[PDB]
Design a protein around this ligand. Structure first.
Ligand code: SF4
Ligand code: SF4
Ligand code: SF3
Ligand code: SF3
Ligand code: F3S
Ligand code: F3S
Ligand SMILES: [Cl-]
Ligand SMILES: [Cl-]
Ligand SMILES: [Cl-]
Ligand SMILES: [Cl-]
Ligand SMILES: [Cl-]
Ligand SMILES: [Cl-]
Ligand SMILES: [Mg+2]
Ligand SMILES: [Mg+2]
Lengths: 268, 581, 581, 268
């Protein structure tokens, strides 16, 4: 049977979200690409370059018009008429619009595509803009995080392939399965938070016993993600478990919510 | 059209123009243009970074303790190296000294990244330039097994295995959905491997794609996650507790055991899979020991990395040597000083930036990042470029130079510097490698040599992982557990005005972050990154950078199919998000 | 000394007495004694369970909902199977029906156990009876590779791999610290593999020791941990949530993806490593198709297992067929009823227990567990048994019988039952296996046949894992998520007095738990476990159990080195903690 | 370099502790046996049987008198003169005492060897007795759990080999590293406990969101172990994560502290 065509494009980005995807432990990215989907265009991995890659792009979006999924990593800049991100001599935003127009649905991978991420942090030199502010006529699933958890990315993919539908989402367009609860709602250090047992300076006695990182700036109380349950890199760790507070990386505007080392002010 | 002479090259933009945009199987956005003569030989090459985000601007006014997290997001491929450079730079500015275990763990984090990055580059990025994946379909599995077993002790070599991989590829392409293989260069005359070596290489591509996910588990233990682990100014946040109550909340013996397990597996994969495949590519493509030399026989640069004496960044401490060679004089390895305003300078006369005087270079403590998109007299228009104008501004990449010289950075550069400083392990390793291929030492200064040096560095980094792990364990045995210095964590303790430099050797080359702090906030933060060197545009004297030089004089079999251009560019492992930041 | 006749055997306790205590490479504590005649042929065999804990006594007065947790600790090798039987028994007593996904998950838990247990048995417990590990040191690595590659598509077969394994073994042995290989039977004339097959087998021993840890990850996902996962009366505790808020707190797509990954790897290992190894053992040890027949051509028993229709334990539901054969009449497979007091009964006239009349057998609903250590005259003392007295009481294992007949249970028994009920897949597998070995069907009824059937069953179970997982995913696609029924969770809902039977096929054979509940608590709890049947002592008619029968008539090459005894006993996979509970 | 000799004996037991040990992911049990210790006697795994096995036992304890580690799984029964557990025709207690006399230290693996476990639960038919009530003149490290976590077992082994010392212990002889804190002190469902958000019946809406299992009988509040942080089977799960309350399996007498489904009475 044919596999569902996917076109994966890249705007302004650091490529953390593609790297995360290839970290997937179950299913392996190899098995996603070979057996679950047809990854038909992806600048990071594809053999073809230049005119040959552009031919693939045109061939796929034409032959599979209305039938492919568009994955987007990064975001388009509006500054300098879009030429802060140039693709085939033209603004990236033109390629994004052309790709989006044929897609059945769009997956906005990562905080870049979802919200803006680091390039959108003050003063936003390029006027980097998240995908849902540019594309307003297509379903967009936001999968935030810098980057999102590898096995969350692959679980969302397998959900879609198995059930033949988009995941149910919250009001912000995030999949409820993995973004429905806060980090602090499933944190293993929550016993310490509720007892007032805090790390006060790095590598103090409290830190050596795994006390809560609230006073070190942890943004877990205001951040929706799966890191405290699913964890990272096939269950190995997550930020807090390795002794750093959550930065809030799955949240819109997290870079400009004050210092990472300032305490969260209005706990929900 | 114009012609001029620089660095032994004749740059001539007459004749047919070829454009490759996008360059694929790199990180980020790059455009390459070349002119070729009637003999299909490249007479002009133009390197253009086609993205910019402006981290140096974004960092203004932030807390220096936060800077690592912002700059880590310069790049997800070389993830962690910018954080390391950042903490180094802020520690240098403020006068912070970290505990030995934090230095050891940082060295572990860097070595881990070298192993992962180099492995993924070899197979997933560069590999399809050398391996004809569709020709794997024609191999005989038994002869593939015999080939693999002649090159390596790696266990996974049965005829049945190679037949199963071959059938997986057969099924994949049967439906006509060739995915990443679609419209490739398969059958190009420069593909020289026999079908059995193509199948072997393709099997290894798949094995490396699976295996690479394990290596970064070391980053998850010490840094929370990969990509983009966590760090602190003052050391690392991963507090250690081996033998006290609450070790379940810290780096404990079970966590250290996980790290050791990953180290052993990583060394085994690199040594028995990547190393013999690199040598095999060398055996079947020896003419590429004479192509893509560029600046590698002229000017090379390393800052050095892996300080073994905590907080000592001198020559006696750095395990990966620093130095610079110019004028092709490899007998004179010169010392590098990143504070000297006459050494590292960046030029923007051919880049999309404003300077007060674009005819001079600026040291990064005087750096300016003022973006100005002005492509001038292009073929096309400024939102629809058919040809860049390389006589004017043509890239988002600034042009760094060292004492005015254009330099190559990266694994070949480092290897040459270490070799010529007389590092014993490097001399032995390079000599044995070149002997195995029956090539002269000069054969390393080439596209093929960049690839061989990269594999050799992955092997070096895997051995260093064990060395650093053992140093950590020695400290723990001696009751030395400390992972952070916090006496200058609070901004009130810092100098009112200070500046610092953080440097290291990223997978792609020499990395520097220059930071100035004033009144508790970042006043200036300038990055010069390895792909900024290699992918550099021209300077006021018309000197070309490493990519443009390496592409010069290259013969193309089929002008419309840029395989030779891709081979040489991929050999440098371009990171365009890094280059522009 | 005496002799008598039973079941076609002449039981004669003249001649030399040989004692093997401890039996090693089993679970728990066993002693075996035999007498051999002047031709070194066994004329008497005595099976003795040398441990007791008393779980049937401990379970009295417990909450029926808690019982699974207690009885699961009957055995950590066949971990989970007793919990399954317990929840079945309690649900049967109370009248609880579980949802379909709970039944499917339970079947996954049982199939996972079959895979894990049979794999570890083949390599870690039985393997060293067949592979001469020290002889591996004389193998040629290239010939080992050639052998491996002729038997299987498994990837791991390079000459370098086998050389590395061999060199590891050499370094292990070199300093004299032979560990688990110390004072083994190496060089015994019954070791018939060539050196290359010994090296291959030892390599696979090491691979299986590593790999087995992955299989049980499926128990960790659904059951929390392994060994000893968690269960509930009413279904399973692992609530499912695929597409709603809070899926992070439940079995979600990421968890299910982990399970699929493990299933694939498990099938791959069993099909390409264990299956070819078993067939090779068969090819080089064909004489063992005529040794250790015992009761396997006379009387065999299966209860059946793996109900595919939730809460239906009938013949149309059970994927693994039940039935009994007696008197060698395999054309009449008889139905088994675990409530019928004339069917399953346990005798204690040769065991260390009190009944009011030890000449009669008790069905488990009338069972009594009143320990009575009384070894009679044993050529030593009550605390120094030199020779058990098999004319009197000689074991902590009760003697089960079916309609008064001594039965064999386990993989061979099940295979024979399924074959003779006309199960198509079994008939076809068995015929092809015996054809590939060039042996008659009757060769299966042997010590070699037990080993081959067990490997076959590991393959069957790995296949059923995928079948069950697909059934689960089909229910989830149809919106059916339920994993627990709680209508009768509260004791106020239960009958004041009720009783029930829970049965299944554990790795070693037919397992039954009989429970009676009164006033909300366990009034009676009796277990009859597969090794209780097989390792059974004698009954009032002098009839011998499966182990004693299989050892009868066996030639020993070297009386002092009990390798033939070990081979036959290990072929039954004895679990002595199970047997005595 | 010679490896440290280990003698592993088995009393009344189910073998869950040996099975747990072989589950170890890092280091692999293979590498422990091949490279870190000399496992010189172990009924479950050794080639020799009967008189050949007894010869190994006697040679090791004599040759390495004062220098081997004794690992003990299970426990000795005092009932019927010790003949509820018979080893080479004599009471297991005699073999335990002979092995213990020559050992430099003893590891008591699991709840059986530490406390008694299931065979010691009311009415204790066999008078099963934990090792420290029989052997009173040797260092005993208790590693409780039914069974202990595989990677805890191997971490304790590697600690001893690497540091050449026994781990520091609490007042009960348990290693502080893994048994210093309660399950409930590092439980990822603690946010829900602190909020009064409880599973009330199996597979209810609360269960499907991962709410706290306290009302379902979770004994985490009174149990010391590493399950909620280190987790089980290479970080895959632990009892609570898969929806069942902790049974209390690492605590002395857990079988007889009421029903597993009765709430913990006086929470610390
Ligand atoms: S503040 Fe952070 S570390 Fe503390 S309990 Fe909440 S998420 Fe965990
Ligand atoms: S009662 Fe149990 S499930 Fe609830 S927070 Fe405590 S340990 Fe976790
Ligand atoms: Fe993930 S490409 Fe990396 S910066 Fe934050 S998501 Fe973007
Ligand atoms: Fe672990 S052998 Fe299994 S019963 Fe509880 S520890 Fe004992
Ligand atoms: S920083 Fe990001 S990775 Fe998770 S723990 Fe916080 S949302
Ligand atoms: S039952 Fe045991 S396994 Fe851990 S979660 Fe509780 S101590
Ligand atoms: Cl793109
Ligand atoms: Cl953002
Ligand atoms: Cl992951
Ligand atoms: Cl023992
Ligand atoms: Cl106990
Ligand atoms: Cl574990
Ligand atoms: Mg810069
Ligand atoms: Mg019984």
């Amino acid at each position: 049977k044919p596999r569902i065509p996917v076109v994966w494009i890249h705007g302004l980005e650091c490529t953390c979200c593609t790297e995360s995807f290839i970290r997937s432990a179950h299913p392996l990215a190899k098995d996603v690409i070979l057996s679950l989907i047809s990854l038909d265009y992806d600048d990071t991995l594809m053999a073809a370059a230049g005119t040959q890659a552009e031919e693939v792009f045109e061939d796929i979006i034409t032959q599979y018009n209305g039938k492919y999924i568009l994955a987007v990593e990064g975001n388009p800049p509006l500054g300098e008429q879009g030429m802060f991100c140039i693709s085939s001599g033209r603004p990236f935003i033109e390629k994004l619009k052309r790709a989006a127009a044929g897609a059945s649905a769009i997956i906005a991978w990562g905080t870049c595509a979802s919200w803006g991420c680091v390039q959108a942090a003050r003063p936003n030199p390029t006027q980097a803009t998240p995908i849902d502010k540019v594309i307003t006529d297509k379903p967009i699933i936001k999968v935030p995080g810098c980057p999102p958890i590898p096995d969350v990315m692959s679980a969302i993919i397998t959900y879609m392939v198995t059930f033949d539908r988009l995941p149910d989402v919250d009001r912000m367009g995030r999949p409820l399965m993995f973004y429905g609860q806060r980090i602090h709602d499933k944190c293993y250090r929550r016993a310490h938070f509720d007892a007032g047992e805090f790390v006060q300076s790095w590598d103090d006695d409290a830190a050596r016993k795994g006390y809560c990182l609230y006073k070190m700036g942890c943004k877990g109380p205001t951040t929706y993600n799966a890191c405290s349950s699913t964890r990272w890199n096939d269950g190995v760790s997550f930020p807090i478990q390795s002794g750093h507070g959550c930065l809030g990386c799955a949240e819109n505007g997290f870079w400009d919510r004050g210092s990472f080392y300032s305490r969260v002010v209005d706990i929900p | 059209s114009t012609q001029y002479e620089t660095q032994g090259y004749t740059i001539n933009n007459a004749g047919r123009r070829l454009v490759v945009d996008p360059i694929t199987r790199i990180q980020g956005h790059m455009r390459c243009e070349v002119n070729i003569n009637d003999q299909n030989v490249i007479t002009n090459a133009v390197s253009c970074g086609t993205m910019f985000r402006g981290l140096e601007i974004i960092l203004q006014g932030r807390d220096p303790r936060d800077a690592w997290a912002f700059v880590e997001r310069i790049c997800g491929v070389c993830t962690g190296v910018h954080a390391l450079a950042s903490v180094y730079a802020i520690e240098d500015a403020i006068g912070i000294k970290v505990p030995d275990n934090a230095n050891i763990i940082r060295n572990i984090m860097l070595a881990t990244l070298w192993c992962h990055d180099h492995l993924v580059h070899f197979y997933q990025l560069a590999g399809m330039d050398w391996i004809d994946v569709l020709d794997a379909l024609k191999a005989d599995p038994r002869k593939t097994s015999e080939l693999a077993q002649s090159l390596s002790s790696w266990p996974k070599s049965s005829p049945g295995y190679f037949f199963d991989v071959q059938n997986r590829l057969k099924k994949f392409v049967e439906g006509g959905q060739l995915g990443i293989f679609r419209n490739g260069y398969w059958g190009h005359p420069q593909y020289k491997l026999p079908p059995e070596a193509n199948l072997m290489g393709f099997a290894h591509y798949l094995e490396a794609l699976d295996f690479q996910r394990e290596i970064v588990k070391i980053h998850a233990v010490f840094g929370g996650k990969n990509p983009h682990p966590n760090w602190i100014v003052g050391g690392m946040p991963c507090a250690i507790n081996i033998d006290e109550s609450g070790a379940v909340g810290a780096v404990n013996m079970e966590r250290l055991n996980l790290v050791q397990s990953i180290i052993t597996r990583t060394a085994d994969f690199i040594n028995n899979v990547m190393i013999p495949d690199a040598l095999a590519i060398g055996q079947f493509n020896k003419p590429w020991s004479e192509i893509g030399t560029g600046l590698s026989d002229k000017c090379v640069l390393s800052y050095g990395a892996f300080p073994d004496i905590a907080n000592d960044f001198g020559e006696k401490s750095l395990l990966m040597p620093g130095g610079a060679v110019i004028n092709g004089d490899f007998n004179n390895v010169l010392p590098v000083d990143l504070v000297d305003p006459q050494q590292v300078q960046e030029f923007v006369d051919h880049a999309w930036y404003r300077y007060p005087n674009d005819q001079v270079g600026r040291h990064p403590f005087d750096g300016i990042t003022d973006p100005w998109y002005n492509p001038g007299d292009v073929k096309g228009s400024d939102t629809n470029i058919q040809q860049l104008n390389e006589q004017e501004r043509y890239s988002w990449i600034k042009a760094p130079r060292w004492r005015g010289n254009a330099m190559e950075v990266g694994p070949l550069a480092r290897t040459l510097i270490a070799y010529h400083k007389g590092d014993a392990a490097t001399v032995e390793s390079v000599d044995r490698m070149m002997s195995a291929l029956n090539l002269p030492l000069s054969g390393i200064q080439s596209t093929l040599g960049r690839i061989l040096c990269r594999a050799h560095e992955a092997q070096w980094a895997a051995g260093k992982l064990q060395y650093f792990f053992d140093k950590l364990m020695t400290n723990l045995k001696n009751g030395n557990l400390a992972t952070a210095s916090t006496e200058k964590w609070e901004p009130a303790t810092w100098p009112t005005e200070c500046r610092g430099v953080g440097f290291t050797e990223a997978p792609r080359g020499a990395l520097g972050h220059w930071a100035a702090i004033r009144d508790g906030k970042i006043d200036l933060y300038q990055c010069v990154v390895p792909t900024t060197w290699n992918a550099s545009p021209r300077d006021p004297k018309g000197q070309i950078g490493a990519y443009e030089a390496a592409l010069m004089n290259t013969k193309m079999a089929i002008p419309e199919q840029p395989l030779e251009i891709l081979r040489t560019l991929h050999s440098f492992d371009p990171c365009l998000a890094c280059s522009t930041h």
